[PDB]
Design a protein around this nucleic acid. Structure first.
Ligand SMILES: [Mg+2]
Ligand SMILES: [Mg+2]
Ligand SMILES: [Mg+2]
Ligand SMILES: [Mg+2]
Ligand SMILES: [Mg+2]
Ligand SMILES: [Mg+2]
Ligand SMILES: [Mg+2]
Ligand SMILES: [Mg+2]
Ligand SMILES: [Mg+2]
Ligand SMILES: [Mg+2]
Ligand SMILES: [Mg+2]
Ligand SMILES: [Mg+2]
Ligand SMILES: [Mg+2]
Ligand SMILES: [Mg+2]
Ligand SMILES: [Mg+2]
Ligand SMILES: [Mg+2]
Ligand SMILES: [Mg+2]
Ligand SMILES: [Mg+2]
Ligand SMILES: [Mg+2]
Ligand SMILES: [Mg+2]
Ligand SMILES: [Mg+2]
Ligand SMILES: [Mg+2]
Ligand SMILES: [Mg+2]
Ligand SMILES: [Mg+2]
Ligand SMILES: [Mg+2]
Ligand SMILES: [Mg+2]
Ligand SMILES: [Mg+2]
Ligand SMILES: [Mg+2]
Ligand SMILES: [Mg+2]
Ligand SMILES: [Mg+2]
Ligand SMILES: [Mg+2]
Ligand SMILES: [Mg+2]
Ligand SMILES: [Mg+2]
Ligand SMILES: [Mg+2]
Ligand SMILES: [Mg+2]
Ligand SMILES: [Mg+2]
Ligand SMILES: [Mg+2]
Ligand SMILES: [Mg+2]
Ligand SMILES: [Mg+2]
Ligand SMILES: [Mg+2]
Ligand SMILES: [Mg+2]
Ligand SMILES: [Mg+2]
Ligand SMILES: [Mg+2]
Ligand SMILES: [Mg+2]
Ligand SMILES: [Mg+2]
Ligand SMILES: [Mg+2]
Ligand SMILES: [Mg+2]
Ligand SMILES: [Mg+2]
Ligand SMILES: [Mg+2]
Ligand SMILES: [Mg+2]
Ligand SMILES: [Mg+2]
Ligand SMILES: [Mg+2]
Ligand SMILES: [Mg+2]
Ligand SMILES: [Mg+2]
Ligand SMILES: [Mg+2]
Ligand SMILES: [Mg+2]
Ligand SMILES: [Mg+2]
Ligand SMILES: [Mg+2]
Ligand SMILES: [Mg+2]
Ligand SMILES: [Mg+2]
Ligand SMILES: [Mg+2]
Ligand SMILES: [Mg+2]
Ligand SMILES: [Mg+2]
Ligand SMILES: [Mg+2]
Ligand SMILES: [Mg+2]
Ligand SMILES: [Mg+2]
Ligand SMILES: [Mg+2]
Ligand SMILES: [Mg+2]
Ligand SMILES: [Mg+2]
Ligand SMILES: [Mg+2]
Ligand SMILES: [Mg+2]
Ligand SMILES: [Mg+2]
Ligand SMILES: [Mg+2]
Ligand SMILES: [Mg+2]
Ligand SMILES: [Mg+2]
Ligand SMILES: [Mg+2]
Ligand SMILES: [Mg+2]
Ligand SMILES: [Mg+2]
Ligand SMILES: [Mg+2]
Ligand SMILES: [Mg+2]
Ligand SMILES: [Mg+2]
Ligand SMILES: [Mg+2]
Ligand SMILES: [Mg+2]
Ligand SMILES: [Mg+2]
Ligand SMILES: [Mg+2]
Ligand SMILES: [Mg+2]
Ligand SMILES: [Mg+2]
Ligand SMILES: [Mg+2]
Ligand SMILES: [Mg+2]
Ligand SMILES: [Mg+2]
Ligand SMILES: [Mg+2]
Ligand SMILES: [Mg+2]
Ligand SMILES: [Mg+2]
Ligand SMILES: [Mg+2]
Ligand SMILES: [Mg+2]
Ligand SMILES: [Mg+2]
Ligand SMILES: [Mg+2]
Ligand SMILES: [Mg+2]
Ligand SMILES: [Mg+2]
Ligand SMILES: [Mg+2]
Ligand SMILES: [Mg+2]
Ligand SMILES: [Mg+2]
Ligand SMILES: [Mg+2]
Ligand SMILES: [Mg+2]
Ligand SMILES: [Mg+2]
Ligand SMILES: [Mg+2]
Ligand SMILES: [Mg+2]
Ligand SMILES: [Mg+2]
Ligand SMILES: [Mg+2]
Ligand SMILES: [Mg+2]
Ligand SMILES: [Mg+2]
Ligand SMILES: [Mg+2]
Ligand SMILES: [Mg+2]
Ligand SMILES: [Mg+2]
Ligand SMILES: [Mg+2]
Ligand SMILES: [Mg+2]
Ligand SMILES: [Mg+2]
Ligand SMILES: [Mg+2]
Ligand SMILES: [Mg+2]
Ligand SMILES: [Mg+2]
Ligand SMILES: [Mg+2]
Ligand SMILES: [Mg+2]
Ligand SMILES: [Mg+2]
Ligand SMILES: [Mg+2]
Ligand SMILES: [Mg+2]
Ligand SMILES: [Mg+2]
Ligand SMILES: [Mg+2]
Ligand SMILES: [Mg+2]
Ligand SMILES: [Mg+2]
Ligand SMILES: [Mg+2]
Ligand SMILES: [Mg+2]
Ligand SMILES: [Mg+2]
Ligand SMILES: [Mg+2]
Ligand SMILES: [Mg+2]
Ligand SMILES: [Mg+2]
Ligand SMILES: [Mg+2]
Ligand SMILES: [Mg+2]
Ligand SMILES: [Mg+2]
Ligand SMILES: [Mg+2]
Ligand SMILES: [Mg+2]
Ligand SMILES: [Mg+2]
Ligand SMILES: [Mg+2]
Ligand SMILES: [Mg+2]
Ligand SMILES: [Mg+2]
Ligand SMILES: [Mg+2]
Ligand SMILES: [Mg+2]
Ligand SMILES: [Mg+2]
Ligand SMILES: [Mg+2]
Ligand SMILES: [Mg+2]
Ligand SMILES: [Mg+2]
Ligand SMILES: [Mg+2]
Ligand SMILES: [Mg+2]
Ligand SMILES: [Mg+2]
Ligand SMILES: [Mg+2]
Ligand SMILES: [Mg+2]
Lengths: 66, 51, 177, 136, 75, 116
RNA sequence: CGCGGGGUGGAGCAGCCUGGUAGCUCGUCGGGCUCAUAACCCGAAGAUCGUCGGUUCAAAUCCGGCCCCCGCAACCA
RNA sequence: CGCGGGGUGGAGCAGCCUGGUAGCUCGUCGGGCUCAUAACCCGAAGAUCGUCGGUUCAAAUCCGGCCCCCGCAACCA
RNA sequence: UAGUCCGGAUUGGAGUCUGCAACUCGACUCCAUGAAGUCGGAAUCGCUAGUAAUCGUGGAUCAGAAUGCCACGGUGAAUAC
RNA sequence: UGCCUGGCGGCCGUAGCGCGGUGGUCCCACCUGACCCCAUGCCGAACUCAGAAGUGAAACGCCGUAGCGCCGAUGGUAGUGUGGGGUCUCCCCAUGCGAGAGUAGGGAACUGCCAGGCAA
RNA sequence: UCCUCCUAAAGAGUAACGGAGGAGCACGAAGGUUGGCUAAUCCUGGUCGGACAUCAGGAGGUUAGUGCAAUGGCAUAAGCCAGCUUGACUGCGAGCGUGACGGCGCGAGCAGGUGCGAAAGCAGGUCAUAGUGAUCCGGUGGUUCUGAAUGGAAGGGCCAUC
RNA sequence: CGACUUACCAACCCGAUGCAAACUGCGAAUACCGGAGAAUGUUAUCACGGGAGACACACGGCGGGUGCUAACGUCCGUC
């Protein structure tokens, strides 16, 4: 790479609230803080909970119950 | 029209000169080419000047 | 860095069993990632480009190229050799470093996320993503930017069928629909 | 009335209608009206000869027109002297050498074909003849 | 008439034909673009005018990948 | 394809140099090995030729494909060229940028005695 | 062809020959006015001198160019 | 037939012969004032520019054909 | 001093009482939602003291359904040359 | 002698496309790497340098096939020089030349010097 | 008046109030040279972003581009890109083309002096073809030239130029 | 906002099929430039001098523009 023209591409430590510590290299500064990662994000459960929302007949039965 | 003509005069030597056209509106600064003076018999800084 | 070593050891060996490749070189490998940012609105304000260039320069490691307009057109009011967008064609070592930083931390930070498009292939294994916000990457400070601007990522491979090229990306634990 | 939809040049040289024709064999239809004589057919004549055919054979059958004008003929107005420019394009003509198939017909009887081509042949300046599609 | 204009003619063509003995500097072909190209001992001026660079006989050849006409001279 | 882009990148030198009618020193570079040959002004027949593929030169060197090897070829060619009677030549870089190995070959060819 | 004068808020003008403080009239928005409209009156919003260069404590100001600026008599290839 | 000039919201005119975002005065439409209508005050909509075409990155504006309109010529014997 | 902890519209969901019955077409509640609006063009309305202004409150009709109507009382002005 | 590579030509489609192959000991390629030489209007992609773990995938070379492109007679036709002629806008005749298109067919180039490896 | 195409009958030339278009310039980088590069237009995928701005791959291969008409020409690229620059240089010029003439044009090599390249080399403007006017008269700078008795001068001349 | 039907018009492509002064992936005859060789020709050729006339052409045959493939029309090439 052309030295001088690019910004400073330094190493830094990512540490989310879940506990997954993870060193990476990027133009940020000193340290990092994250919410979610590839692990801990609800996509494997998200698609299970999102798709199984519908159900109109049982909702009627839950009111009447007879 | 528009493009006038100028007299490129030498610096070091006799008052020998060249002549070229020049657009004065687009290029308001002056030329400073390095052309050959045949009286002195050498390449010299030829400055722009008016007729 | 780590994903290149992971690819060399774990992924190739996984892809060898799928399509019974005769050689190790037959496996599709990721050639380059081309981050593109057609700012466009630089016609009105000239600095708005230089704002985008700094944001790409922050997002990627390297500095971007200011791409000129190829032809003049009346639809957008642009002419030959006018700076309309910005780009980065990062590859090699910093590419694998960015590719981890994209899929591992940035892609999860996408707003209203669900599952990335499986259909999105060119018919030659070359994938592309379209990020709406710049804020999804952790490089940008929150009180610095002042525009709903984004980029598009464009993963180039040495595949031949999108069918073949899907498995490569799928082997990195890439989120598909 | 047949005419080229846009051309390169408005006015064309007179030229010389010479040699034999090229569109000689009956290609599309079963029958055909071949030009025996030499000449040049106007855009009006072709339409007039087509109308005479199409009306004879009724709704049935299928007709082709192998010839097309694509040659503008200029004419100088009345009470005008010579020179002062090439004249204005009045009508469009197709140059017809001997042997050229003009019209072709299909899906009709041989008895009723010839009578339909007589009615067209009457409209045209050039002397014509009937020709059948021979297999090779 | 709307038109009625023309330029003066330029006298372009092969001045010295194949086999003809030509002197060093003799113009062989005046033309616009390089229809003919410069071969052995033949030049090509700013006007694309092919001229003899040596005293000899003019030779027309048809060689090359794109099958172009070349003009050579052999003493 | 790369080769074809290198051929057309070279062609202007070759076609200009064959017109003049000069003895050209062609230098084909390769990741492994470097070649060099002095070709007659007609272009067909070769007068002198040497490379790192030749065992005579390969047996001496550490690795066949570097600046120190290119000098060993560049010396070897120019050493033969003077024995044959060649001296005034041209250098056809052959679509390779004049910088590293080819420069080391050229400078060695100059330092050996071959005049260009 | 010239020698001369002339050059500012949007614009017309001065002020420019005796360097230290760019005014002035129409385009400007809010008032007061009146059951109201016109007027009339009051205050606000805009150029550091067309523009670039030397010196000297201070330069629209002294001096040189430009874009250029109009005036002229002379210009009879 | 010949050479000038035209054709732009519903009306009459600018913008058109120097291609980049179409004004003016009326009328129409909405609301005011009035007992009501007019006048008057206050907003608003309304023209892809005769048409078929070319030139251009882009045409009301450039160029060509066709379709109307208006002026001038249409002469000597 | 922000379209704001201003406004509280609008929508989705979950309800509540009445009432044979609440979708056309009720009222209220909870939850999330958070529109226009930053004092209003020409105009123009009411008001001369417990009056204007502002904050509650009641009743009549009424199974349910007021921001209307009819009453009630709090703090409480300016100005009338 | 031969069989395989590379380099540089000659010759420019009978020589080029596609498809089907098969080759890695050298040769070639990608491949490895990025202080150094050098490189990017960003990027060791390119160009460049230092290498030897891998493969023959891609690219390249070689063999096979007419699906195309390409070459192409003989005969005829058109045209046309010269002297005639006619029913003269167009033809015709003697004699000389003689296409283009198509047709039978051909058809996966043929070689030159030079270098290297292997069977000799 | 000048350029391009056809008319123009396969060298050149060739008319008409015959058929169609252009020019009265532009550029200190749009010249030089060295080193690179390859296009149009579609297809599919991709944030805002849509037919089309920017990106990726695939398709086609010069339909592109060439400062301006038209013609001929260009991948060795004359195309588009960068790095230094000033050869858009003075004196010439073997030998040709084209003109009735005036004139116009092409030009290897030599002397002198540069530029670019590592060097072969290339460079006496621009891919070529229009962008232009003779003489007289007068102006401006230069000058081993002339100078009406002699010394100067004016005024002429020669060179550059308006 | 979810989407079906269709008396249908028809590119780029394909396989036929014409046309073209200003179209050409081809291509003659003659003419034309140069070379060599006979034969024949009153040097017929080229140069430089002294003289000039002429620069309104006409028709006919082949190639054309223009006109109506009209004109004893008009305007060019070649005899
Ligand atoms: Mg049509
Ligand atoms: Mg003809
Ligand atoms: Mg034909
Ligand atoms: Mg045919
Ligand atoms: Mg006329
Ligand atoms: Mg011409
Ligand atoms: Mg002519
Ligand atoms: Mg001779
Ligand atoms: Mg030259
Ligand atoms: Mg004068
Ligand atoms: Mg009107
Ligand atoms: Mg406008
Ligand atoms: Mg009005
Ligand atoms: Mg409006
Ligand atoms: Mg409308
Ligand atoms: Mg333009
Ligand atoms: Mg223009
Ligand atoms: Mg417009
Ligand atoms: Mg305008
Ligand atoms: Mg908000
Ligand atoms: Mg608001
Ligand atoms: Mg609410
Ligand atoms: Mg809120
Ligand atoms: Mg507020
Ligand atoms: Mg209020
Ligand atoms: Mg209030
Ligand atoms: Mg009031
Ligand atoms: Mg009131
Ligand atoms: Mg009272
Ligand atoms: Mg309240
Ligand atoms: Mg309350
Ligand atoms: Mg109440
Ligand atoms: Mg009650
Ligand atoms: Mg109430
Ligand atoms: Mg209330
Ligand atoms: Mg291909
Ligand atoms: Mg191939
Ligand atoms: Mg093996
Ligand atoms: Mg590499
Ligand atoms: Mg191995
Ligand atoms: Mg190996
Ligand atoms: Mg392979
Ligand atoms: Mg092969
Ligand atoms: Mg066969
Ligand atoms: Mg052949
Ligand atoms: Mg053929
Ligand atoms: Mg051939
Ligand atoms: Mg033959
Ligand atoms: Mg035979
Ligand atoms: Mg034959
Ligand atoms: Mg004949
Ligand atoms: Mg005859
Ligand atoms: Mg006879
Ligand atoms: Mg033959
Ligand atoms: Mg043949
Ligand atoms: Mg054939
Ligand atoms: Mg055919
Ligand atoms: Mg066949
Ligand atoms: Mg056979
Ligand atoms: Mg067979
Ligand atoms: Mg083949
Ligand atoms: Mg093959
Ligand atoms: Mg073979
Ligand atoms: Mg065979
Ligand atoms: Mg062959
Ligand atoms: Mg072979
Ligand atoms: Mg003339
Ligand atoms: Mg022609
Ligand atoms: Mg001609
Ligand atoms: Mg000719
Ligand atoms: Mg001829
Ligand atoms: Mg002549
Ligand atoms: Mg003549
Ligand atoms: Mg003429
Ligand atoms: Mg003109
Ligand atoms: Mg410079
Ligand atoms: Mg440049
Ligand atoms: Mg240049
Ligand atoms: Mg260099
Ligand atoms: Mg170059
Ligand atoms: Mg083109
Ligand atoms: Mg062209
Ligand atoms: Mg450039
Ligand atoms: Mg540059
Ligand atoms: Mg330097
Ligand atoms: Mg000199
Ligand atoms: Mg000379
Ligand atoms: Mg001599
Ligand atoms: Mg001479
Ligand atoms: Mg002459
Ligand atoms: Mg002369
Ligand atoms: Mg000239
Ligand atoms: Mg010239
Ligand atoms: Mg030279
Ligand atoms: Mg010489
Ligand atoms: Mg020298
Ligand atoms: Mg010196
Ligand atoms: Mg020197
Ligand atoms: Mg020097
Ligand atoms: Mg040097
Ligand atoms: Mg060196
Ligand atoms: Mg040196
Ligand atoms: Mg040199
Ligand atoms: Mg020269
Ligand atoms: Mg040049
Ligand atoms: Mg140029
Ligand atoms: Mg150039
Ligand atoms: Mg010029
Ligand atoms: Mg001119
Ligand atoms: Mg005079
Ligand atoms: Mg005179
Ligand atoms: Mg004087
Ligand atoms: Mg002097
Ligand atoms: Mg003097
Ligand atoms: Mg002298
Ligand atoms: Mg003197
Ligand atoms: Mg004297
Ligand atoms: Mg005296
Ligand atoms: Mg005296
Ligand atoms: Mg005296
Ligand atoms: Mg005297
Ligand atoms: Mg004097
Ligand atoms: Mg004088
Ligand atoms: Mg001189
Ligand atoms: Mg002198
Ligand atoms: Mg077709
Ligand atoms: Mg076909
Ligand atoms: Mg055919
Ligand atoms: Mg033709
Ligand atoms: Mg042509
Ligand atoms: Mg052609
Ligand atoms: Mg042929
Ligand atoms: Mg052929
Ligand atoms: Mg040919
Ligand atoms: Mg022949
Ligand atoms: Mg021939
Ligand atoms: Mg001869
Ligand atoms: Mg002869
Ligand atoms: Mg002879
Ligand atoms: Mg003899
Ligand atoms: Mg004799
Ligand atoms: Mg004799
Ligand atoms: Mg005489
Ligand atoms: Mg005479
Ligand atoms: Mg005459
Ligand atoms: Mg006469
Ligand atoms: Mg006369
Ligand atoms: Mg006459
Ligand atoms: Mg005559
Ligand atoms: Mg005749
Ligand atoms: Mg004839
Ligand atoms: Mg003939
Ligand atoms: Mg006649
Ligand atoms: Mg008679
Ligand atoms: Mg006559």
């Amino acid at each position: 790479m052309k030295k001088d023209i690019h910004p400073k591409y330094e190493e830094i430590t990512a540490s989310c609230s879940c506990g997954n510590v993870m060193k990476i290299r990027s133009t940020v500064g000193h340290d990092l803080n994250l919410d979610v990662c590839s692990k801990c994000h609800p996509f494997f459960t998200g698609k299970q909970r999102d798709v199984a929302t519908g159900g109109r007949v049982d909702r009627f039965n839950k009111r009447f119950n007879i | 029209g528009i493009r006038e003509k100028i007299k490129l005069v030498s610096s070091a030597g006799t008052g020998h000169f060249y002549t070229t056209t020049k657009n004065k509106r687009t290029k308001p600064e002056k030329l400073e080419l390095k052309k050959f003076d045949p009286v002195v018999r050498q390449h010299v800084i030829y400055k722009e000047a008016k007729i | 860095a780590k994903l290149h070593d992971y690819y060399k050891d774990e992924v190739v060996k996984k892809l060898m069993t799928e399509f019974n490749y005769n050689s190790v070189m037959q496996v599709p490998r990721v050639e380059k990632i081309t981050l593109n940012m057609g700012v466009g609105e630089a016609i009105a304000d000239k600095k708005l480009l230089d704002n985008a260039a700094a944001d790409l320069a922050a997002i990627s490691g390297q500095k971007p190229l200011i791409t000129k307009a190829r032809k003049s057109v009346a639809g957008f009011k642009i002419r030959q050799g006018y700076p309309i967008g910005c780009k980065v064609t990062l590859r090699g070592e910093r590419m694998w470093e960015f590719f981890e930083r994209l899929i591992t931390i940035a892609v999860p930070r996408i707003r209203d996320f669900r599952g990335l498009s499986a259909k999105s292939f060119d018919g030659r294994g070359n994938y592309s993503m379209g990020v709406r916000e710049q804020i999804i990457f952790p490089e940008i400070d929150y009180d610095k930017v002042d525009r709903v601007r984004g980029l598009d990522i464009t993963i180039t491979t040495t595949a031949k069928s999108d069918e073949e090229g899907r498995a490569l990306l799928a082997a990195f634990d890439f989120p598909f629909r | 009335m047949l005419q080229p939809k846009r051309t390169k040049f408005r006015k064309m040289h007179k030229g010389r209608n010479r040699g034999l024709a090229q569109g000689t064999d009956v290609s599309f239809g079963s029958f055909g009206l071949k030009a025996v004589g030499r000449g040049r057919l106007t855009a009006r004549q072709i339409e007039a000869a087509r109308r005479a055919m199409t009306r004879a054979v009724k709704r049935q059958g299928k007709i082709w027109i192998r010839v097309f004008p694509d040659k503008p003929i200029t004419e100088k107005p009345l009470a005008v002297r010579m020179g002062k420019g090439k004249g204005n394009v009045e009508y469009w003509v197709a140059l017809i050498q001997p042997g050229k198939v003009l019209y072709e017909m299909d899906g009709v009887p041989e008895e009723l074909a010839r009578e339909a081509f007589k009615l067209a042949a009457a409209k045209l300046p050039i002397k014509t003849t009937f020709v059948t599609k021979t297999v090779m | 008439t709307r038109n009625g204009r023309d330029s003066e003619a330029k006298r372009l063509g092969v001045k010295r034909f194949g086999g003809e003995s030509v002197l060093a500097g003799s113009i062989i072909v005046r033309q616009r673009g390089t229809k003919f190209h410069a071969g052995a001992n033949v030049g090509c001026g700013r006007d694309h005018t092919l001229f003899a660079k040596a005293d000899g006989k003019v030779k027309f050849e048809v060689k090359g990948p794109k099958n172009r006409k070349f003009i050579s001279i052999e003493a | 394809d790369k080769k074809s882009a290198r051929i057309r990148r070279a062609t202007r030198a070759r076609r200009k140099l064959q017109e003049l009618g000069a003895t050209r020193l062609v230098v084909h570079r390769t990741p492994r090995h470097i070649y060099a040959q002095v070709i007659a002004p007609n272009g067909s027949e070769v007068l002198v030729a040497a490379s790192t593929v030749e065992k005579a030169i390969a047996e001496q060197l550490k690795y066949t494909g570097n600046k120190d090897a290119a000098a060993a070829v560049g010396k070897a060619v120019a050493e033969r060229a003077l024995e044959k009677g060649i001296k005034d030549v041209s250098f056809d870089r052959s679509g390779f940028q004049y910088h590293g190995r080819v420069q080391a070959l050229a400078d060695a060819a100059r330092e050996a005695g071959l005049q260009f």
